Ligand binder design. Structure first.
Ligand SMILES: *[C@@H]1O[C@H](CO)[C@@H](O[C@@H]2O[C@H](CO)[C@@H](O)[C@H](O)[C@H]2NC(C)=O)[C@H](O[C@@H]2O[C@@H](C)[C@@H](O)[C@@H](O)[C@@H]2O)[C@H]1NC(C)=O
Ligand SMILES: *[C@@H]1O[C@H](CO)[C@@H](O[C@@H]2O[C@H](CO)[C@@H](O)[C@H](O)[C@H]2NC(C)=O)[C@H](O[C@@H]2O[C@@H](C)[C@@H](O)[C@@H](O)[C@@H]2O)[C@H]1NC(C)=O
Ligand SMILES: *[C@@H]1O[C@H](CO)[C@@H](O[C@@H]2O[C@H](CO)[C@@H](O)[C@H](O)[C@H]2NC(C)=O)[C@H](O)[C@H]1NC(C)=O
Ligand SMILES: CC(=O)N[C@H]1[C@@H](OC[C@H](N)C(=O)O)O[C@H](CO)[C@H](O)[C@@H]1O
Ligand SMILES: *[C@@H]1O[C@H](CO)[C@@H](O)[C@H](O)[C@H]1NC(C)=O
Length: 257
């Protein structure tokens, strides 16, 4: 079977065939999301991803290789097969390299690169091309709240009127301050007990998050998950820590009006 969607990534821009051209070798880029046909990608059972009747194609299979559109019958088979890991990567199975947006700007050309679990390598396959805006409810049924750039995130009692409890869940798998969308939830290191803060979005692995089926919020590079330190909300510290399933690591998203 097949179905068609946009592909949203870095800074909420979309995977777009450059200029709408369908000539073999036309690179893929970031561009503001829209309905144009060169942003509509059809996913088939054969592991191809197609726009304008042609296939997303690795124009080479080394670090830094370009990703292009190319005739599906004449391209190399191992260059047109893709899988979509649950954490939001888009991977070429033959090479193991993943789709990457090396810069945030529109017209940035997409490349295959070694997987470092960066936010530049996060994508979401969807027809809703706007970030989802939600409260993130956790331990003691409190809400995750931001407190300014460079400051910690922490738990507060949930308030419909607290804008700092409002999070934009971007397609690149970042968690952004909804009223200041250039700022991202960021782990301040990849080791256990490292603090979670707000920092300018820079596409980093420290800024990538995965909402898994167990109710954890996982940082893929470290493997560690968001944790209310010591189960003590009055410490006003959220850390990364190995997944335990304990209440201080359980979260849900609740969409906002
Ligand atoms: C795969 O390609 C990447 C993009 O070119 C490399 O990362 C970039 O490496 C540059 C040095 O050659 C460096 O100035 C860029 O800032 C960096 N971009 C970022 C932020 O990832 C990557 O190179 C590896 O990682 C970088 C950061 C350095 O540590 C290099 O020594 C590494 O080789 C390439 N990866 C590999 C394994 O070839
Ligand atoms: C992908 O390349 C194929 C091989 O070059 C194209 O098929 C060829 O299209 C030629 C020019 O239209 C035509 O003379 C031949 O009939 C045909 N050759 C083969 C091997 O099938 C293909 O074109 C599409 O598929 C063919 C079968 C027809 O249905 C065309 O109308 C299609 O455009 C190329 N695919 C695309 C999307 O360009
Ligand atoms: C989250 O932030 C967004 C972006 O600033 C807010 O969305 C704007 O809201 C106004 C009022 O409805 C609209 O006129 C704009 O079109 C919106 N802009 C965008 C880019 O969507 C939003 O209200 C904030 N809060 C919530 C709950 O989403
Ligand atoms: C419809 C289409 O092909 N759109 C393209 C094209 O857009 C240029 C202007 N803005 C237009 O709407 O016609 O080129 C940009 C930049 O390369 C994108 O590829 C866009 O999707
Ligand atoms: C929780 O943190 C506050 C601030 O450090 C501290 O005063 C309090 O004793 C802590 N609670 C427990 C049970 O350790």
């Amino acid at each position: 079977t097949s179905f068609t969607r946009n592909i949203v990534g870095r800074d909420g821009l979309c995977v777009d065939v450059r200029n709408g051209y369908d000539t073999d070798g036309t690179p893929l880029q970031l561009w503001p999301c829209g309905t144009q046909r060169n942003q509509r990608w059809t996913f088939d059972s054969d592991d191809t991803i197609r726009s304008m009747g042609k296939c997303m194609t690795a124009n080479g299979l080394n670090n830094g290789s370009n990703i292009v559109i190319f005739n599906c019958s004449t391209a190399a088979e191992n260059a047109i097969k893709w899988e979509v890991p649950i954490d939001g990567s888009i991977i070429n199975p033959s090479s193991g390299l993943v789709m990457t947006a090396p810069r945030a700007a529109s017209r940035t050309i997409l490349l295959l690169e070694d997987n470092i679990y960066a936010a530049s390598q996060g994508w979401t396959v969807t027809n809703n091309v706007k970030p989802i805006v939600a409260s993130i409810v956790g331990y003691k049924e409190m809400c995750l709240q931001s407190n300014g750039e460079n400051n910690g995130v922490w738990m507060e009692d949930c308030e419909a009127t607290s804008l700092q409890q409002q999070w934009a869940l971007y397609g690149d798998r970042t968690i952004r301050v909804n009223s200041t969308r250039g700022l991202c939830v960021t782990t301040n290191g990849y080791n256990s007990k490292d603090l979670i803060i707000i920092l300018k979005c820079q596409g980093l692995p420290s800024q990538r998050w995965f909402f898994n089926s167990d109710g954890a919020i996982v940082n893929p590079k470290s493997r560690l998950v968001m944790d209310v330190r010591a189960s003590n909300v009055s410490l006003r510290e959220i850390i990364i820590f190995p997944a335990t399933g304990n209440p201080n690591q359980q979260w849900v998203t609740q969409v906002l009006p």
